[PDB]
């Protein structure tokens, strides 16, 4: 899963 999601979850 992309960092943009990983970092904001």
């Amino acid at each position: 899963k992309p960092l943009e999601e990983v970092l904001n979850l």
Partner: antibody, heavy 118, light 113 residues
Framework: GVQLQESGPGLVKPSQSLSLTCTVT?????????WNWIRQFPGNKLEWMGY???????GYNPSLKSRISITRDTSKNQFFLQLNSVTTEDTATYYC???????????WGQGTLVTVSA | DVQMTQTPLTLSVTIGQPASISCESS???????????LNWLLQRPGQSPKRLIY???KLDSGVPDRFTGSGSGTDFTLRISRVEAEDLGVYYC?????????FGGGTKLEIKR
């Protein structure tokens, strides 16, 4: 100096475990972003190894999951890479880098040469 | 494991002339959230990779107008309007929508003189 720095042995005998350190200067490794480890093999070939997020979460490259491990020391603001059971194939240039893939923040270190040989 | 293919393997440009590099991914890099995580890196001799473009077309700071990125889905294009001496080095293409993240085989740019 600079912003990101790799330190560690430059030589490691096969079968043992490699251990690298990335000292981060200028920004808190707990604030934001993903702190990765990338390595460049003799041929310009780049391989992302894994990262550890500002929250302690880790992600590893499946080709390495078994023998890879990434940790950090939030007090000394630095993160580590532990690669076990190295072989001469693990010889390469190791870089630590920070980025999130969607904002302006992007920094690579200068990298360290790690050669595996008896 | 998603492959990224770049062409040409080498590129010989005269200073002042325009240049363009291509990158093909084995799968669409479009993410369900609409964005497509594709970045461009330049590695100058004796230095570590430097990101030039992110999100297919956004230029990183300190990067000149000369560099433009474009494409979508599976095909991407890095283009330099006017090549400069300082533009020599190897260009990498990298994706971040599929796990693990993957790099391109690189494209070496040599100044013809």
């Amino acid at each position: 100096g600079v912003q990101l720095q790799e330190s560690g042995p430059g030589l490691v005998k096969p079968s043992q475990s490699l251990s690298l350190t990335c000292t981060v200067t200028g920004y808190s490794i707990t604030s934001d972003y993903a702190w990765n480890w990338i390595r460049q093999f003799p041929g310009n070939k780049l391989e992302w190894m894994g990262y550890i997020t500002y929250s302690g979460s880790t992600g590893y490259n499946p080709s390495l999951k078994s023998r890879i491990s990434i940790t950090r020391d939030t007090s000394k603001n630095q993160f580590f890479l532990q690669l076990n059971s190295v072989t001469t194939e693990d010889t390469a240039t190791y870089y630590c880098a920070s980025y999130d893939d969607y904002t302006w923040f992007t920094y690579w270190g200068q990298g360290t040469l790690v050669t595996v040989s008896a | 494991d998603v492959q990224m293919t770049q062409t040409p393997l080498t590129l010989s440009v005269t200073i002042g002339q325009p240049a363009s590099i291509s990158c093909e991914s084995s799968q669409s890099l479009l993410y369900s959230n609409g964005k497509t995580y594709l970045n461009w890196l330049l590695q100058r001799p004796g230095q570590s990779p430097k990101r030039l473009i992110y999100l297919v077309s956004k230029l990183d700071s300190g990067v000149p107008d000369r560099f433009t990125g474009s494409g979508s889905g599976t095909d991407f294009t890095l283009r330099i309007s006017r090549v400069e001496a300082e533009d020599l080095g190897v260009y990498y293409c990298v994706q971040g929508t599929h796990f693990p993240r993957t790099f391109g085989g690189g494209t070496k740019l040599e100044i013809k003189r």
